[PDB]
Design an enzyme around this catalytic site. Structure first.
Site, PDB file in Angstrom:
ATOM      1  N   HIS A  62      61.984   9.200  33.472  1.00 17.48           N
ATOM      2  CA  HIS A  62      61.349   9.517  34.742  1.00 17.48           C
ATOM      3  C   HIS A  62      62.375   9.406  35.866  1.00 17.48           C
ATOM      4  O   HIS A  62      62.125  10.050  36.890  1.00 17.48           O
ATOM      5  CB  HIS A  62      60.020   8.928  35.110  1.00 17.48           C
ATOM      6  CG  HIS A  62      59.968   7.448  35.150  1.00 17.48           C
ATOM      7  ND1 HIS A  62      59.538   6.731  34.074  1.00 17.48           N
ATOM      8  CD2 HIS A  62      60.308   6.559  36.116  1.00 17.48           C
ATOM      9  CE1 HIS A  62      59.605   5.428  34.397  1.00 17.48           C
ATOM     10  NE2 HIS A  62      60.026   5.307  35.640  1.00 17.48           N
ATOM     11  N   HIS A  92      67.007   2.694  41.500  1.00 16.66           N
ATOM     12  CA  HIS A  92      66.879   4.013  40.912  1.00 16.66           C
ATOM     13  C   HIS A  92      66.667   4.994  42.112  1.00 16.66           C
ATOM     14  O   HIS A  92      66.536   4.531  43.240  1.00 16.66           O
ATOM     15  CB  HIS A  92      65.771   4.205  39.871  1.00 16.66           C
ATOM     16  CG  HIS A  92      64.473   3.782  40.546  1.00 16.66           C
ATOM     17  ND1 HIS A  92      63.993   2.503  40.555  1.00 16.66           N
ATOM     18  CD2 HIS A  92      63.624   4.582  41.243  1.00 16.66           C
ATOM     19  CE1 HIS A  92      62.884   2.488  41.266  1.00 16.66           C
ATOM     20  NE2 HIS A  92      62.685   3.744  41.662  1.00 16.66           N
ATOM     21  N   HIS A  94      64.768   8.882  43.552  1.00 17.73           N
ATOM     22  CA  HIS A  94      63.787   9.946  43.504  1.00 17.73           C
ATOM     23  C   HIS A  94      64.488  11.152  44.208  1.00 17.73           C
ATOM     24  O   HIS A  94      65.089  10.866  45.241  1.00 17.73           O
ATOM     25  CB  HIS A  94      62.460   9.679  44.283  1.00 17.73           C
ATOM     26  CG  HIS A  94      61.788   8.482  43.597  1.00 17.73           C
ATOM     27  ND1 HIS A  94      60.870   8.637  42.615  1.00 17.73           N
ATOM     28  CD2 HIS A  94      61.993   7.167  43.705  1.00 17.73           C
ATOM     29  CE1 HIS A  94      60.470   7.479  42.145  1.00 17.73           C
ATOM     30  NE2 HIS A  94      61.151   6.588  42.835  1.00 17.73           N
ATOM     31  N   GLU A 104      60.274  10.147  48.868  1.00 20.39           N
ATOM     32  CA  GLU A 104      58.843   9.797  48.661  1.00 20.39           C
ATOM     33  C   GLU A 104      58.235   9.515  50.047  1.00 20.39           C
ATOM     34  O   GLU A 104      57.231  10.222  50.388  1.00 20.39           O
ATOM     35  CB  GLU A 104      58.748   8.600  47.716  1.00 20.39           C
ATOM     36  CG  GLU A 104      59.257   8.976  46.258  1.00 20.39           C
ATOM     37  CD  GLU A 104      58.567   8.012  45.284  1.00 20.39           C
ATOM     38  OE1 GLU A 104      58.741   6.812  45.292  1.00 20.39           O
ATOM     39  OE2 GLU A 104      57.822   8.567  44.493  1.00 20.39           O
ATOM     40  N   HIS A 117      65.670   3.336  45.723  1.00 16.79           N
ATOM     41  CA  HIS A 117      64.799   2.134  45.709  1.00 16.79           C
ATOM     42  C   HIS A 117      65.483   0.923  45.052  1.00 16.79           C
ATOM     43  O   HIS A 117      65.964   1.120  43.859  1.00 16.79           O
ATOM     44  CB  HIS A 117      63.449   2.359  45.056  1.00 16.79           C
ATOM     45  CG  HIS A 117      62.569   3.384  45.692  1.00 16.79           C
ATOM     46  ND1 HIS A 117      61.551   4.041  45.067  1.00 16.79           N
ATOM     47  CD2 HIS A 117      62.471   3.808  46.977  1.00 16.79           C
ATOM     48  CE1 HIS A 117      60.897   4.890  45.864  1.00 16.79           C
ATOM     49  NE2 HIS A 117      61.475   4.701  47.046  1.00 16.79           N
ATOM     50  N   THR A 196      55.295   3.351  43.155  1.00 14.61           N
ATOM     51  CA  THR A 196      55.114   4.786  43.341  1.00 14.61           C
ATOM     52  C   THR A 196      55.016   5.521  42.038  1.00 14.61           C
ATOM     53  O   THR A 196      54.729   6.756  42.043  1.00 14.61           O
ATOM     54  CB  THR A 196      56.079   5.424  44.393  1.00 14.61           C
ATOM     55  OG1 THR A 196      57.326   5.454  43.702  1.00 14.61           O
ATOM     56  CG2 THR A 196      56.114   4.763  45.793  1.00 14.61           C
TER      57      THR A 196
HETATM   58 ZN   LIG Z   1      61.144   4.351  43.059  1.00 10.71          ZN
END
Ligand SMILES: [Zn+2]
Length: 258
Positions: A62, A92, A94, A104, A117, A196
């Protein structure tokens, strides 16, 4: 089948398996800068990452996580709106398929190319697994990425991506210093929210930095080369692994600055 970011298992479907998806303190949100309240009672963040010990980088299907040794107070966050010591466990990102989407959190509806994050857990709970079950269990520092100049401190990460191309792969990733990912200023926004991704537990105090860092186009290009799929499975590029903004509902966003 299992959750992801595709048309059939994407954010719009999560509620079916994780009803908390439609909860009261869901993340991310849009940060309305004119409605955020300056709160002069908030203290400056305290980031102590000089003893950080990175261990490995993994593709979990992911995103990609860089994990740290959290058996002791080596890399911690405290101050800001937090009580107690929060230990860095992993970081990590996004990101998007195009440079105009990927973050996000949004600022006055503006989307950034990516969102970093840094995940921390409250030491009073003894382990990460117990921390996620508490309303003050986690502290996440979110940093926005915009495309401009390359970020030197991010290259070590970019370079190992080839070796963790598909789901399940991992690589030794020692001696990485997360201090190279911070903006100059530590001014922030804070609100009570959640993870999230599933299980979307409402255990996070979000700490969103006002100042974005810049990455080069070629740096973010390398992110878009990862895969959601596992080796020998049909290729699905890892892009757009971001959840859209959720309703603020009964929450106030506070600002550490004016
Ligand atoms: Zn995250």
């Amino acid at each position: 089948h299992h959750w992801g970011y595709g048309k059939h298992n994407g954010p719009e479907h999560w509620h079916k398996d994780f009803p908390i998806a439609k909860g009261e303190r869901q993340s991310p949100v849009d940060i309305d800068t004119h409605t955020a309240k300056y709160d002069p009672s908030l203290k400056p963040l305290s980031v102590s990452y000089d003893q950080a010990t990175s261990l490995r980088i993994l593709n979990n299907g992911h995103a990609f996580n860089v994990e740290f040794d959290d058996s002791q107070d080596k890399a911690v966050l405290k101050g800001g709106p937090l009580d107690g010591t929060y230990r860095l466990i992993q970081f990590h990102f996004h990101w998007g398929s195009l440079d105009g989407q990927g973050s996000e959190h949004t600022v006055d509806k503006k989307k950034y190319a990516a969102e970093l994050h840094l995940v921390h857990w409250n030491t009073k709970y003894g382990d990460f697994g117990k921390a996620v079950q508490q309303p003050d269990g986690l502290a996440v520092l979110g940093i926005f990425l915009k495309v401009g100049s390359a970020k030197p401190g991010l290259q070590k990460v970019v370079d190992v991506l080839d070796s963790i191309k598909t789901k399940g792969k991992s690589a030794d990733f020692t001696n990485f210093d997360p201090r190279g990912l911070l903006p100059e200023s530590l001014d922030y926004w804070t609100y009570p929210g959640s993870l999230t991704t599933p299980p979307l537990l409402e255990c996070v105090t979000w700490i969103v930095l006002k100042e974005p860092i810049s990455v080069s186009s070629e740096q973010v290009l390398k992110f878009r080369k990862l895969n959601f799929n596992g080796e020998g499975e049909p290729e699905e590029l890892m892009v757009d692994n971001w959840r859209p903004a959720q309703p603020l509902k009964n929450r106030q966003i506070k600002a550490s600055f004016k």
